Amino acid sequence: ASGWGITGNKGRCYDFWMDFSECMSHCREPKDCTLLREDYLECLHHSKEFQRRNRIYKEEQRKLR
Amino acid sequence: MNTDITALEKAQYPVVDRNPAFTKVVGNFSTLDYLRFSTITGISVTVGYLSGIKPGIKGPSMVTGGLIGLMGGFMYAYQNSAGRLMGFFPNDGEVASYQKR
Amino acid sequence: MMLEFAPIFIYLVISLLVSLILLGVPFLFRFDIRFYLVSILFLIFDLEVTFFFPWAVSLNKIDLFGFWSMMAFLFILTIGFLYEWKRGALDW
Amino acid sequence: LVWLEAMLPLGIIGGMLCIMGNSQYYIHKAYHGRPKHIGHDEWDVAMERRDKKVVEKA
Amino acid sequence: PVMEKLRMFVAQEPVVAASCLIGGVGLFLPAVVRPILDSL
Amino acid sequence: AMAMFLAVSGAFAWGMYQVGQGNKIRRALKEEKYAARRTILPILQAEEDERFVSEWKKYLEYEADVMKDVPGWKVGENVYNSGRWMPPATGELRPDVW
Amino acid sequence: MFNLFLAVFPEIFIINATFILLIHGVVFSTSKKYDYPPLASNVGWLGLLSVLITLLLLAAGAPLLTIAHLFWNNLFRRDNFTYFCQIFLLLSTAGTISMCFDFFDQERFDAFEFIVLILLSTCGMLFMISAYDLIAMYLAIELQSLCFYVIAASKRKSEFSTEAGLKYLILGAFSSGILLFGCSMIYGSTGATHFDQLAKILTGYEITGARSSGIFMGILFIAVGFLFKITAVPFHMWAPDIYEGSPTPVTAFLSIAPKISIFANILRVFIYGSYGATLQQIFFFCSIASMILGALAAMAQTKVKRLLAYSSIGHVGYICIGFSCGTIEGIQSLLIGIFIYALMTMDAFAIVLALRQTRVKYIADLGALAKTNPILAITFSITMFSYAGIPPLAGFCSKFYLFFAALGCGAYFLALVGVVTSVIGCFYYIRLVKRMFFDTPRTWILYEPMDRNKSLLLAMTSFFITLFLLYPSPLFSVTHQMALSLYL
Amino acid sequence: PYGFWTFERHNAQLRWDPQISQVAGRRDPYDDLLEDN
Amino acid sequence: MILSVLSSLALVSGLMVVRAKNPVHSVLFFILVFCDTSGLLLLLGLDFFAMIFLVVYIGAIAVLFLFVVMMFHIQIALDNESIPLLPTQRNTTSLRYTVYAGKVRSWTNLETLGNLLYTYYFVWFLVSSLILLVAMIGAIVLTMHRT
Amino acid sequence: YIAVPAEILGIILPLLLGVAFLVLAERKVMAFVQRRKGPDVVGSFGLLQPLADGLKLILKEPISPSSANFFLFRMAPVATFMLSLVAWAVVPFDYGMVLSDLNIGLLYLFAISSLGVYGIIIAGRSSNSKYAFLGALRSAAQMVSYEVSIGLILITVLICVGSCNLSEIVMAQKQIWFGIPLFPVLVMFFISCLAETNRAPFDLPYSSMGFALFFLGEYANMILMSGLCTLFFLGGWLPILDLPIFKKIPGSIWFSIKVLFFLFLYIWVRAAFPRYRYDQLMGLGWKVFLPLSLAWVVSVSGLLVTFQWLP
Amino acid sequence: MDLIKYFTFSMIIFILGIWGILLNRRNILIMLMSIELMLLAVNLNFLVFSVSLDDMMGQVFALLVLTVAAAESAIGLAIFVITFRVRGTI
């Protein structure tokens, strides 16, 4: 969110945060910037990508047996 | 370092020299600014003198109170002069002086 | 970039082993308050030295603002040290 | 003349100091073929990894 | 006065006077000399 | 005496000047080293891109085969609604330090 | 560049004045010419002068508080709420300093570092109110906590003061750890620490899809830490013991100043942290329990300071009623209650310090006070009735408007608990008035007359308490203006 | 209020970050590679 | 591997700290807790913070606690935010994109911190300075008995 | 990768031999200063004396004073010996002859030096002698009080370099050595190292191995501080400032020569001056060296910033 | 999975600190070392989160909280020292 990176460059998730915050700067209803909020929160934790990979692994294991 | 002098609440009075230098603000002191400076300094000196009699240090307490009063009064006068120049306080004389400039 | 600590860890292990060998060579055949004040002063000035290390290295990027910020920090701790001095906590 | 007899142990110390530094220059070179590089940054580390992979490939 | 109190302080506190002098020089250089060089 | 102060204070001035003059040379050398890196970056990045796209083709070929049966799937669907491409995440919170 | 610091002259002045006072005291206390003068009153008077001058600097420079707001954005945020909160805090600090002058002379408290530490705590609270980040809020909280830990154990030879200081430090460090863990859990879940960012990231996803465990846990931990700070039950672990064991001039300051700033922080957390009305439930339970426990515990107290501590807990619950109902008229009731409670507490502690020169410890000690000093008894009875909430006095307005705010949100259970607690409080407050006027003790205790500072403070506060209902408009106007400015 | 995040007082990072966008420590890695020419 | 043992030893050390009879042994295990935490930080690449933990925690605070214990009495006494990734890294390790643009001029943990500790967030730095000054002042007034 | 223990042995064993011969060199120089001859009968010029002393100390049939927990008492010499030896993993002897090239080497040295306080404290407590406990408690405070000044001097050195890498601090002195401008800083650093090691005027003070490990650790600390004094101020392995014709001499020889020179200063200062008192050690270290070190930090930083001579 | 382990270790350290504050109510020193354990756990949380999110707002905060922890140690030990003197016991 701050944009100060660990290695002296721009933060990894700073661009997503600036897209989300720019969306919220001209949208009084927060239900239309949800798609950018989800992107920012997914850049922080990679929950969706990890879930997809876990689903692929589980499907592979089920086919194994 | 990057700096920004813009304020959240805009100035309600005409703005002359939006970002004044220290020397120019000090050179903008009016009679009222000197009056409040001297008042604060004298009050501080008197309080220091009166409060230091019982311990037994009149001169040292006088000087300590005088330093406090000088610092406080100077910063108060600088605050008023800068606000007048920047347009946050009624700058009746400032606009008159800098219009003919 | 952090690969240079494994030699240090192996050095620690081998120094441990050689110290144990050295110990095994002959086997085969009231309260004072100033001691607390000195520790307090050490803690404060050790934190101050800690805060110097980022400043000294990164003194080329920051310029005339970080320098004066560090100067204000040192001024505050110098007032503290002067209070430490005149109160007799530095005497033994 | 006569003061050189106190420089013998003090020169043995210098010999030990020299051998400690020279023991890690011909042992580290022995199993790498290259002297140690000072100032390892992640660019140098990654570029060494790329060197190892390209040498292994061809 | 000043030239006598300062002499008394410096005589009995040489190390403090020396440290204060060198620190004052090190603070004087970036406060009075740096802006002068900024004009050039 | 007095000459001791003169020699120490002149050393502190001339030596600091020489220290600055050597820091200039060190900065120039470091800048040359950095400038030699920005001229070979494109080819290294090109090789990395080729390797990554080949491995990504392999990974998509793998994931398409394993779960062909599942009705709801997209095979390499971006998880970002914006559509930006991001590197595949790893279970290491600092991989390039060891 | 120098004009960017126009937003921090009130803090720069007080910091530099504290430094000058410290240098002056340490130089002249350890002096041979003046035979080690006990210059505690001198430093106290000069510190009061410094507080008044920084009040003049802060109050006059009202349009200049938003100057360079972009440059100072990440550090602190100054607005109308901060302006009035800081002015009130400086006024309370000046009042406490005025009260504690007589303590330095009769009891011979010659340590001048007490005033320096009070000024440093004041600086910490000034930085606390304007803090707009988790980092700044935590740092200011820790600074004031340390300044209070040191002065709580100022009476080194006293058994109570050392134990009170130890308990205070342990409790405060534990609460700070809980709050700091909450801040860490919030930062690790949203990636942001600034209040603007933390509001934009939480205002949309109002637990609409799922409950974020990290965010919920961090919010709960921050709320729990803040509740320890204000001593709302069951987070009142050692608050009565700390209040009793602490020196009376010290207890006067901790009963007023640490509450204004912490309540400001809690408000500036509610502006963004309203995550599913989670805090509204926590503060609801805490307020009910606080009122009930204060009412049921202050009736079993025979000492004046323990009764004051339990009164403080009960009034904290009454104020948290306003937190439980999140609305402009709820925050306004909260701020009015804070103001009135602070003034009543200053009045009561000035009265206690007036009688502390004769070592008053029990309520029965002030038995024949209506005969020896028949005007001090009237003033103390007025203060007690104001605590009770009798209609004609100023203490009724705060409880009235708080109950109105509680009924506005529709919480009828809060109103009944408040009414019962008010009845119990009024009973144990008029119990004190019974002792002064109606009892005829065999042995009397004669007190020595107070000094000018406390006499003037008592006169002004007693005229405020009795005659507040006649002209209450300015307080309501400023409070409504502050409540609206929390968001716009 | 209805959309208080849209207010100017609550949008300060949108005006400060562009001013500090070129400061070292916040730059796009490819930004400095093209500032030579 | 290294993480598991370096965490297990720290847990055992902390358990011994909170459940020790002789406070000297408690302080000694209190030192080992930070000795393990420094290694854990080193595993993260925060070399500066591990060294500061050695310097500050077990260099100043631990020494102070040891002084107080010794000379005085030695008396007796998950799936919500970041779902974990299952061990599927045979293909994931190959899917490692490296951007050489961020490596041409890389900062260290020290200068990265010092770039913004003293200019963009200097007020908090001065507040910590004031906290240190408060500690210095409070050390004397509580504990001082001359002559 | 099985050659790392070879490097560690090659840096540890010659260190111990150098420590023994440093004890011999001390006992020989302190004799030639006093117009006598040191140990000479045992060896050709006394060179075999350390081996004889080591064997005689080993063959003593000593008893362990187990009137304690016996764990802390036995491990305290080990705890100090490990810390004394581990600081040598970062000191560079020439361009590429460093075992571990840390990028935080300066602060790592500060940490290693600061944790060396525990060994003496644990030794003082574990021994039941109350006076030994008090002596260890005083020595720890002295070491701490001068560690502060050592750190502040390290900050002054770091300002002119801009990096914590020890191998780059030497490369930063290719123009001139830092001992020429910062000569008072060099003198203060040498005096602080004298007081840090409990040696020379700042020297206020069991059986078999424990005392041997303490003795070896203290002398290894002496060698390490002599190496640091030339690593930061005398240019490390860099040749003499001028006359670049002797460049055939390896760089590791110059580091050795400068370290031997600083060891000779150690012995000379021990032989030439009496011992301070504790009430004067603490005063000297808290009122004469702290202000001077802080003022030198301020002066160097202000002068470098003013003329833009920063790294 | 490494973030889970890093958070679990610090959570256990925090729990141990709370236990030490609660269980060792009789002894004062344990009630200080447990607070320091809690501060250590929170600092580890901040550093791990800063590394995980690639943000420098956790490292600055860890450095600034080190000062608070040290100052709390100093004040607490001074208060304990004066406390033992008065009552003669812990």
Ligand SMILES: CCCCCCCCCCCCCCCCCC(=O)O[C@@H](COC(=O)CCCCCCCCCCCCCCC)COP(=O)(O)OCC[N+](C)(C)C
């Ligand atoms: C400039 C930056 C700030 C520098 C100081 C920062 C730290 C603050 C330290 C404050 C405490 C020390 C303040 C100075 C103490 C010395 C006071 C002094 O110089 O006056 C002396 C003596 O000097 C004098 O002549 C009196 C000076 C006081 C009156 C001066 C006019 C009032 C000045 C106040 C306003 C201006 C501020 C001070 C000047 C900048 C005191 O007088 P006595 O010794 O009591 O008189 C001797 C006779 N008999 C003992 C019998 C009583």
Ligand SMILES: CCCCCCCCCCCCCCCCCCCC(=O)O[C@H](COC(=O)CCCCCCCCCCCCCC)COP(=O)(O)OCCN
């Ligand atoms: C190539 C190699 C060259 C040699 C390298 C090694 C150098 C050291 C060689 C040995 C030197 C003698 C060592 C003796 C060790 C014990 C001496 C300690 C005595 C001491 O500390 O003096 C104190 C004061 O002097 C002091 O403070 C002493 C420290 C002074 C440092 C110099 C600071 C001068 C700054 C001037 C700067 C001007 C130029 C730059 C602008 C006490 O003395 P006291 O009894 O009076 O008590 C102070 C009351 N005030």
